[PDB]
Design a protein around this ligand. Structure first.
Ligand SMILES: [Cl-]
Ligand SMILES: [Cl-]
Ligand SMILES: [Cl-]
Ligand SMILES: [Zn+2]
Ligand SMILES: [Zn+2]
Ligand SMILES: [Zn+2]
Lengths: 128, 125, 128, 126, 129, 129
């Protein structure tokens, strides 16, 4: 399902954030501010279709928040059978991950110049 | 080989947590406790090689924490080039993920019976 | 000074918040959510020209944040001379306040119906 | 006249804080301490009749906290009718404020000398 | 000929601190109500942190200790100093029953009143090695 | 004929708890570094809260007690019970010196190692009236 509701939510969310004056200034400045970091947490919490939010400046990811329960399952689901059925302790390398993730990338501008980008996404473990 | 320092850290960390009385009782009880949830956060924060920590009871994942910066990059890395270089907006569907993640599974026991497990892992490219 | 920079900041800020899906749902629902409450705090902190932010539903003010230092002075300034110069303890009635405060009112809509409003303002103790 | 219950609460509250050793030392020192700042927040939260609390040294206001819902209404009340009834957007300049606010000023002393004061108040519409 | 000692500075700090807290309206209501409030609990922490001579603060209602805070470094040493020798000088690991402390602790007890009736008390103290 | 008593459940809980904490990488690094970290401080609080038999937890470096947490209700009573009587029954404000303490406290000491060298210790205990 790549329904428009989701597509829309992702775009509006990313856009809204991209238009915030202080978000723009922050990316420009390069200074790390934990309150901005915290600011992104609201979107994961209050918007069901947003499982991941990333705010990056031109150097890279600066702030980031994820739906910890949702994303956590991604890294567990596979190869959990052994420990659960025996009481066996072991190592397991997981190459890549299961499922798919829909993302929307939105650049961020300040005083006419691009200072970074914002990515917003939803995770899918099934398909339909 | 596969760096023993890391392998060690993962195992000790998971073991340590497995041996905590209240962690054992909690998994047995089935009740959800936010302080336990918070307890796991210390390991991500204070241990560099721990990017993911999961605590599950026999039903499934109960508590969980991730290094949000680390894991966030997983979902970005691929297809970030365009927006960064040409300043354009778009959708991009990512099937699975790039890189690899080393995990260690540790069962959890209470009064002789297994009540769940703990997974601890590090992400790589 | 009723310069456009300020006027603009107030309007954008209020508009931005009015367009947030979860802000709309929250006012509709009537449930009190402390994370929304906290959400408004970012605007006071990060935007210099915003000294006050109020979010009200149709019953009244629901969430609110103020620049505590800025607004605090309003209630002190007057009649502080005595205690400061003598060591006199006393009561003093102040009606109402000094200075002026520029505000912008923005309604909030959800599914086509108005569910409340948002007020954003800046305080002035002088004039120019 | 007023209401003595309130008058009393304001006075006790201010007095209590005045008598705290660390509050006295802090005003004397001039150093800014966020834990003291936080200390004042309890009074707004836990005491219904306290809408404003200010702690000032001889230079001026140093720490301060307000009942954000209470004080917020002051700045709204007056010109809210329009947006609420006709759903329209606009600017509105408010000269001063409506209502009245009862305050109590209490000096603060350290080693015999006055180092500041504490103001505690309640806001009223009528 | 004996010689006792009396530091009034400390004695005064303890009394003013306890009194101050006793006079707080919300402290009184809280003890009356019986409800547990973590913000009150936190409120007591300021006194340990900001007042050097206050190593212990206890707030009790008529049932018993309700809120409490201690200077963790100061009080911690009490439980170590005595049987810390072994672990510290190649012990290493062991069990030990300690009775009593030792050292001495000066306390001041202050009752708490609400609407004319006593609803509890406040104890404030300093520890001496 | 005397009769000692030995509750292994408790003895066990204390030892596993202390051991567990000793084995935490960041606990080891922290003691080595000497820097004070409030999150570590907070980390120790979980054990008091969630483990009934743990009334005291102390984490010390080679200099001394660094972090510490106590079951504030439990330990508070220690400092009250003895000269609690007068304030609770009569008036009644006063000063009181308590020499040492009543009751007994079972502790377990566990050293802490980092990169082969001992950087401190952890003490875990339960109080008995
Ligand atoms: Cl499997
Ligand atoms: Cl790419
Ligand atoms: Cl004046
Ligand atoms: Zn926030
Ligand atoms: Zn914690
Ligand atoms: Zn506080």
């Amino acid at each position: 399902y790549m329904d428009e509701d989701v597509r829309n939510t992702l775009k509006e969310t990313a856009f809204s954030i991209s238009e915030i004056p202080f978000i723009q200034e922050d990316l420009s400045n390069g200074e790390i501010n934990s309150r901005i970091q915290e600011y992104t947490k609201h979107f994961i919490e209050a918007i069901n279709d947003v499982d991941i939010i990333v705010v990056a400046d031109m150097r890279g990811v600066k702030y980031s928040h994820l739906d910890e329960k949702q994303i956590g399952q991604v890294f567990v689901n596979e190869d959990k059978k052994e420990v659960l059925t025996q009481g066996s302790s072991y190592y397991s390398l997981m190459k890549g991950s299961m499922g798919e993730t829909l993302r929307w990338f939105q650049p961020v501008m300040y005083n006419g110049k691009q200072v970074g980008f914002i990515m917003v996404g939803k995770y899918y473990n099934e398909i339909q």
